């Protein structure tokens, strides 16, 4: 499910759904979300997260070969742990996205 991992710093960053969306409108909502997440990745900056921690996350993904809420929680804990141990006290993993693709994207606000 998850062969790739990306971490992006997105400081600025939830959708109030339309009430009686048709089938075509649901499809267009999914397409809109994909396109906007592409733009969000493109305009965001790479994380300070060093290569070794990236390899640790890659190993966590390769061990299960399938993403789940518990795995995303463990990845969040690892990333936040590195950030807080490095001196970025208000660093926070705010989301994971692009879950429909082979590449899990981790969103962090670094602060400090």
């Amino acid at each position, epitope marked *: 499910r998850a062969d790739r991992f990306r971490c992006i710093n997105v400081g600025l960053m*939830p959708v109030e759904m339309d009430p009686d969306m048709s089938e075509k409108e649901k499809i267009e909502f*999914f397409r809109r979300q994909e396109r906007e997440y592409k733009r969000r990745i493109s305009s965001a900056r790479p994380c300070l997260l060093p290569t070794s921690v990236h390899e640790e996350i890659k190993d966590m993904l390769a061990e299960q070969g399938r993403v789940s809420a518990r795995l995303l929680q463990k990845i969040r804990d690892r990333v936040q742990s590195w950030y807080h141990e490095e001196g970025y006290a208000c660093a926070q993993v705010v*989301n994971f996205g692009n879950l429909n693709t082979r590449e899990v994207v981790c969103e962090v606000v670094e602060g400090d």
Partner: antibody, heavy 125, light 109 residues
Framework: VQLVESGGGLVQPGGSLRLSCAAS????????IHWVRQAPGKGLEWVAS????????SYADSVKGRFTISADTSKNTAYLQMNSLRAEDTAVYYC???????????????????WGQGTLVTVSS | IQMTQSPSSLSASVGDRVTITCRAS??????VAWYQQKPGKAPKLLIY???SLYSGVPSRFSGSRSGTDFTLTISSLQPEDFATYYC???????????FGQGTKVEIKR
């Protein structure tokens, strides 16, 4: 939009059975398929789900390891392979469609809106 | 995570207001759906996202959320409304779905 269950019947304990769910009328790559069962005189029990959009499968703990959910996306069909069947698995099995979006922080579901007519599985010697 | 419905069953007359509650147990959520099932038939979706009326469902059905407590209200109970009603939660990252135990609604006459 229609879902049709097939493959139910009578099977001995410890046996195996493969149920199929042919779902016509939508884009399989954007909706999850759920198997939900109802034993006689008991409530609805969610069994398993497969999302083609997120490429994921999920199982209830009561069937993990015995049941395998899968999908043939070209045929618009989902499958529930049931192995090591027990008397307590005797039930009406329905398949249902759920349009489902998720991130880590939030998600959205339009409900299990389309349901099949159900197929009875009887596990008895 | 558990979904605890209340009451287990109830009886009310044509025209009455019926209320069914459902508490999400051991987790917050936001995606709760309500279903109506006739005996031996496939359940029918009534409400999604805890407040949104599904296509074709009469407007006497309504839903509301107060934290982890969700409520299905039938405003003008009709004779064809006898059924078992279920709540259901859909959490993040395709986590397993859970149904409530169901509330059986009988018509008093």
């Amino acid at each position: 939009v229609q879902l049709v269950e097939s493959g139910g019947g009578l099977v001995q304990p410890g046996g195996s059975l493969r149920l199929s769910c042919a779902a016509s009328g939508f884009n399989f790559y954007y909706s999850s398929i759920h198997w939900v069962r109802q034993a006689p005189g008991k409530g609805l029990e969610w069994v398993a789900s497969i999302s083609s959009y997120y490429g994921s499968t999920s199982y209830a703990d009561s069937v993990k390891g015995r049941f395998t959910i899968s999908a043939d996306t070209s045929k618009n069909t989902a499958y529930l392979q049931m192995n090591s069947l027990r008397a307590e698995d005797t039930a009406v099995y329905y398949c249902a469609r759920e349009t489902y979006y998720t991130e880590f922080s939030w998600s959205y579901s339009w409900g299990l809106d389309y349901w099949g007519q159900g197929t009875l599985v009887t596990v008895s010697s | 995570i558990q979904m605890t419905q209340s009451p287990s069953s109830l009886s009310a007359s044509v025209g009455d207001r019926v209320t069914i509650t459902c508490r999400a147990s051991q987790s917050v959520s936001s995606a709760v759906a309500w279903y109506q099932q006739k005996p031996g038939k496939a359940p029918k979706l009534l409400i999604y996202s805890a407040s949104s009326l599904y296509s074709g469902v009469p407007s006497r059905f309504s839903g509301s959320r107060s934290g982890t407590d969700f409520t299905l209200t039938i405003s003008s109970l009709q004779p064809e409304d006898f059924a078992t009603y279920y709540c259901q939660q859909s959490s993040i990252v395709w986590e397993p779905i859970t149904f409530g135990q169901g509330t059986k609604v009988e018509i008093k006459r």
